[PDB]
Amino acid sequence: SRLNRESVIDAALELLNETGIDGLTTRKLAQKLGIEQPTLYWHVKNKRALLDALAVEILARHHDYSLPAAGESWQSFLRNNAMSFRRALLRYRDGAKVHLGARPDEKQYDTVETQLRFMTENGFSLRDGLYAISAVSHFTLGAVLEQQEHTAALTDRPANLPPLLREALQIMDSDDGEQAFLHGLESLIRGFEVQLTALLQIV
Amino acid sequence: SRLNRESVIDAALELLNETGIDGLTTRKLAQKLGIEQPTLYWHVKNKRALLDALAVEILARHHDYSLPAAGESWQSFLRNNAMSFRRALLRYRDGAKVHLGARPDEKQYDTVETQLRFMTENGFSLRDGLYAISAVSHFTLGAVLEQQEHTAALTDRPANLPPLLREALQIMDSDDGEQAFLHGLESLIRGFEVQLTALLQIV
Numbered sequence: 162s163r164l165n166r167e168s169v170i171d172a173a174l175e176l177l178n179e180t181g182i183d184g185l186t187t188r189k190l191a192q193k194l195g196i197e198q199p200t201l202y203w204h205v206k207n208k209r210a211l212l213d214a215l216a217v218e219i220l221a222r223h224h225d226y227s228l229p230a231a232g233e234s235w236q237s238f239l240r241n242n243a244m245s246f247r248r249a250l251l252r253y254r255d256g257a258k259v260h261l262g263a264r265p266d267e268k269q270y271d272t273v274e275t276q277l278r279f280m281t282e283n284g285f286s287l288r289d290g291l292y293a294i295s296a297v298s299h300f301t302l303g304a305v306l307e308q309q310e311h312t313a314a315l316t317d318r319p320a321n322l323p324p325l326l327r328e329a330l331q332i333m334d335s336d337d338g339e340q341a342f343l344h345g346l347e348s349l350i351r352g353f354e355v356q357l358t359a360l361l362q363i364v
Numbered sequence: 365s366r367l368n369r370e371s372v373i374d375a376a377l378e379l380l381n382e383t384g385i386d387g388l389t390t391r392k393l394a395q396k397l398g399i400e401q402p403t404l405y406w407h408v409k410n411k412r413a414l415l416d417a418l419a420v421e422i423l424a425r426h427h428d429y430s431l432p433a434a435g436e437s438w439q440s441f442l443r444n445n446a447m448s449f450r451r452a453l454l455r456y457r458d459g460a461k462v463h464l465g466a467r468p469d470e471k472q473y474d475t476v477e478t479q480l481r482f483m484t485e486n487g488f489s490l491r492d493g494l495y496a497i498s499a500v501s502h503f504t505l506g507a508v509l510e511q512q513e514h515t516a517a518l519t520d521r522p523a524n525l526p527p528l529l530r531e532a533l534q535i536m537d538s539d540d541g542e543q544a545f546l547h548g549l550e551s552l553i554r555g556f557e558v559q560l561t562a563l564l565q566i567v
């Protein structure tokens with residue numbers, strides 16, 4: 162079929178959902194596209210190049226809150242940005258693992274620069290704004306990775322529990338992690354605000 | 365050589381540092397131990413069983429702050445627990461990925477139950493204490509995963525930056541992520557405290 166970049170991404174994403182990240186291979190991608198492996202090689206040099214591209218295109222296509230709305234507070238931005246990033250990560254099987262393979266790509270530079278500048282325009286130093294943005298990113302990624310690895314590990318093998326842990330798993334599995342994620346997100350934001358408003362005061 | 369459980373773990377950990385998680389195989393483990401693959405199979409049924417065991421033994425051996433000190437505050441416990449968990453995760457190549465393969469194992473039940481009970485004894489509901497413990501876990505795991513994947517991806521391929529991002533990478537690479545981790549950790553803890561002390565007040 163067609164092997165323009167967009168079409169190759171479409172197929173690779175379709176394949177990722179079928180196989181997961183570990184099981185995705187350029188050989189399987191060539192099969193899905195109806196082509197020979199050396200043909201695919203002209204377009205996609207190896208799995209790593211493919212994964213790097215997926216990490217970018219997943220956010221380009223499905224992360225709709227990269228940028229603040231006009232007039233938006235930094236708090237509200239971090240909240241909306243996190244919710245969007247989580248959704249985009251969860252959209253594809255092993256999505257968090259796909260993301261983590263790389264740091265910002267050149268096509269992402271303008272976006273992430275704008276985010277860093279936005280925090281500095283709202284009273285943060287570059288360093289403290291980077292600390293906040295990174296903390297949100299890492300908390301979000303960790304939460305998704307946990308969900309997605311539990312989905313995986315369930316396919317290899319199943320799972321005398323003590324009472325609070327029993328209850329905690331029952332609670333942690335009453336939704337897809339969303340309550341825990343949102344509650345932690347608010348805690349994080351509030352801690353950043355306390356820190357910011359403190360200025361040079363001992364806090 | 366010897367194939368008691370302890371000795372197999374020792375060798376597998378040694379191998380993990382040599383290969384990383386994706387490149388670790390039971391075939392390579394059998395080679396390191398000087399044995400045939402069917403011999404190893406009697407002891408270790410597959411890679412997943414091996415990884416599950418490593419996730420547990422890495423913490424048993426190297427996470428020394430599972431439990432609070434007598435009289436310790438919940439804040440100080442979460443801090444010390446996080447620092448220890450991070451160190452243990454960072455100790456082995458792809459350690460965060462090793463951890464994420466599983467939820468608490470039976471040999472961990474008493475430990476994690478004690479942690480959940482400890483939060484409830486310090487004013488949290490089980491749910492809100494679980495929210496805090498999970499948030500710390502996920503933030504810590506996300507931060508480590510980012511560091512460890514950057515170490516990996518560097519071996520496949522290297523890396524016009526805009527100025528804040530340039531500076532952010534220079535800042536994010538001035539240590540091994542420790543400043544960013546510790547600053548986020550304090551933000552998280554403080555947000556949990558604000559929430560706890562609020563009780564039923566609009567906050």
Ligand SMILES: Cc1c2c(c(O)c3c(O)cccc13)C(=O)[C@]1(O)C(=O)C(C(N)=O)=C(O)[C@@H](N(C)C)[C@@H]1C2
Pocket residue numbers: 220224226227228242243246263264265269272273276277294295297298532533536
């Ligand atoms: C600023 C920054 C970001 C990211 C990142 O990986 C990163 C880094 O690895 C080093 C230095 C800075 C950054 C994000 O991945 C990203 O997810 C992202 O690419 C991004 C985006 N593309 O819109 C975001 O929304 C951000 N958000 C989750 C806080 C965050 C921004």
Ligand SMILES: Cc1c2c(c(O)c3c(O)cccc13)C(=O)[C@]1(O)C(=O)C(C(N)=O)=C(O)[C@@H](N(C)C)[C@@H]1C2
Pocket residue numbers: 329330333423427429430431445446449466467468472475476479480497498500501
């Ligand atoms: C309570 C709990 C924990 C963990 C966990 O995975 C988990 C879960 O998957 C479902 C429900 C509850 C928990 C931890 O991994 C763990 O890392 C852990 O095993 C653990 C430990 N073994 O000492 C911890 O130190 C904890 N800390 C990082 C907050 C955390 C505790």
Ligand SMILES: [Cl-]
Pocket residue numbers: 162163164165
């Ligand atoms: Cl074509």
Ligand SMILES: [Cl-]
Pocket residue numbers: 165166167168
């Ligand atoms: Cl195209």
Ligand SMILES: [Cl-]
Pocket residue numbers: 185186187188207208
């Ligand atoms: Cl491949």
Ligand SMILES: [Cl-]
Pocket residue numbers: 232233234237
């Ligand atoms: Cl707002």
Ligand SMILES: [Cl-]
Pocket residue numbers: 365366367368
């Ligand atoms: Cl033996």
Ligand SMILES: [Cl-]
Pocket residue numbers: 368369370371
């Ligand atoms: Cl033993």
Ligand SMILES: [Cl-]
Pocket residue numbers: 388389390391410411
């Ligand atoms: Cl294997």
Ligand SMILES: [Cl-]
Pocket residue numbers: 435436437440
């Ligand atoms: Cl204390």
Ligand SMILES: [Mg+2]
Pocket residue numbers: 260263264265298
């Ligand atoms: Mg990133």
Ligand SMILES: [Mg+2]
Pocket residue numbers: 463466467468501
């Ligand atoms: Mg865990």
